[PDB]
Amino acid sequence: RSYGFRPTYGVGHQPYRVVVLSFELLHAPATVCGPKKSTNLVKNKCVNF
Amino acid sequence: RFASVYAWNRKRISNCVADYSVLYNFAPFFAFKCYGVSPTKLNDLCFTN
Amino acid sequence: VYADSFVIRGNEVSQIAPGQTGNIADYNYKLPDDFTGCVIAWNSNKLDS
Amino acid sequence: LSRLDPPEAEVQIDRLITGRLQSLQTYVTQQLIRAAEIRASANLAATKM
Amino acid sequence: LSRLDPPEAEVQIDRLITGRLQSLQTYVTQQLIRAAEIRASANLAATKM
């Protein structure tokens, strides 16, 4: 069945468009990440990582 | 002509089949807030009135 | 990540959500119960009528 | 479960699960205390015999 | 905490707080009962000695 769209129709019957971005998180090799600068490495000292 | 708030009408319905997915054509709206019952499941429930 | 878009009627904007049933979602497009994304819905009458 | 859809049915039944777990915990704690009480009388009876 | 904003992050973590508190309470109650059990055997050993 096909829709019939006309400007006479008000809200509810007025056509809508839906855009979906769907992530997925997993403990797998990450390939997408945001614009954040990397840093160097330190060893044997209590640090944040 | 819809009745004013100070005098509203009411109809009590009984002794008939309960089909509820057909009302989408005879009344324009946007929400269909069926808080109590899932709309698609009304085909099976038996109601008092 | 996945990106997609499609056009529907405005009566069922809330029908694209986990656990939503009905002919407009059961046989057209239904989300999984554990969806996690950025759903965007726009009233497209200037460009889709 | 036959009255509502899963997305809020699970919200409704979470409280039932928590309440029944609390009741079972109370029952087992009371039984443990009563058993500890009975053991002393059993030991006294053994000594008397 | 790094995944969601505070207003619903606190809602999410409230359940964790409650569950962990319940677990700790169960642990300490069991330890109290076991200690009460052990004390009787200690007293019996003292009398035998």
Strand ordering across the sheet containing A15-22 = C2-9, A15-22, C37-43
Query: For residue C38, what are the β-bridge partners?
Result: A21
Specify the resolution in Å: 3.5
Q: How many DSSP H helices and E strands does chain B contain?
A: 0, 0
Experimental approach: cryo-EM
Out of E26, E29, E36, whose CB is closest to D36? E36
Chains that touch B (3 or more CB pairs under 8 A): A, C, D
Tokens of B26: 């005879």
From the CB coordinates, do chains D and E have 3 or more pairs under 8 Å?
Answer: yes
C-alpha dihedral over E4, E10, E12, E16, to 10 degrees? 130
> What distance, in Å, lies between the first and last C-alpha atoms of chain B?
26
Residues A3 and A15: their CA atoms lie apart, in Å, by 9
Grouping H, G, I as helix, E, B as strand and the rest as coil, residue A16 is strand
Q: Chain B within 8 Å of A14 (Cβ-Cβ)? A: no
- Give, in order, the Cα–Cα distances in Å from A49 to each of A33, C41, C46, E2: 17, 39, 50, 14
Q: Please, where are the H alpha helices in chain D? A: 6-48
Binary contact (C49, A15; C-beta < 8 A): yes
Between vectors from CA D16 to CA D12 and to CA D21, what angle results, nearest 5°?
145
Binary contact (B29, A12; C-beta < 8 A): yes
Integer-rounded Cα Rg, in Å, for chain C is: 12
> What distance, in Å, lies between the first and last C-alpha atoms of chain E?
59
Question: How far is Cα of residue C41 from the mean position of the Cα atoms in its chain?
Answer: 8
Residues C5 and A20: their CA atoms lie apart, in Å, by 6
